[PDB]
Amino acid sequence: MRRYEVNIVLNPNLDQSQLALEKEIIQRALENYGARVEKVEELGLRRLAYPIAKDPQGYFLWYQVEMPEDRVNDLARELRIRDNVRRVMVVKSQEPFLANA
């Protein structure tokens, strides 16, 4: 059981219905792989520095979770199946390293 951070970037063109469905599939797949969600930040659409899937912007989801390590990779796979999900990056959480303190 380790503490990770899931970054997901999806299609900015989604109406609230499709979007809700996508987040639903994210929750579903998450529980399926045994990840407890400690917190969440929905940053919404933001302007990408380079076009992703031909689209100038993207919708951002961030989950801080705790899950069994063995299946983390196996998780990302599933998360990448959905067409509307254009990015997935999972990262082991780390204590912040402050500069100029």
Partner: protein, 73 residues
């Protein structure tokens, strides 16, 4: 010699390991998308080394550029 300013001295309290914070990290990138040298950033070895990885992370996430076009000239 880069006597204009150092990016660290031009900044306040911040987290080097946070890849999602653009308005700071952007200050560490050049006119082009390139990561700045220790001369410009005024960081230390360890600091710079962490900055590099977090910046690359931000790049992959689509938040920061890999490269940019050079204005003027």
């Amino acid at each position: 010699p880069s006597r204009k300013a150092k990016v660290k001295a031009t900044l306040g309290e911040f987290d080097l390991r946070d890849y999602r914070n653009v308005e700071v990290l952007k200050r560490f990138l050049s006119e082009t998308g390139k990561i700045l040298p220790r001369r410009r950033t005024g960081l230390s070895a360890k600091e710079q080394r962490i900055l590099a990885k977090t910046i690359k992370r931000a790049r992959i996430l689509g938040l920061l550029p890999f490269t940019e076009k050079l204005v003027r000239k």
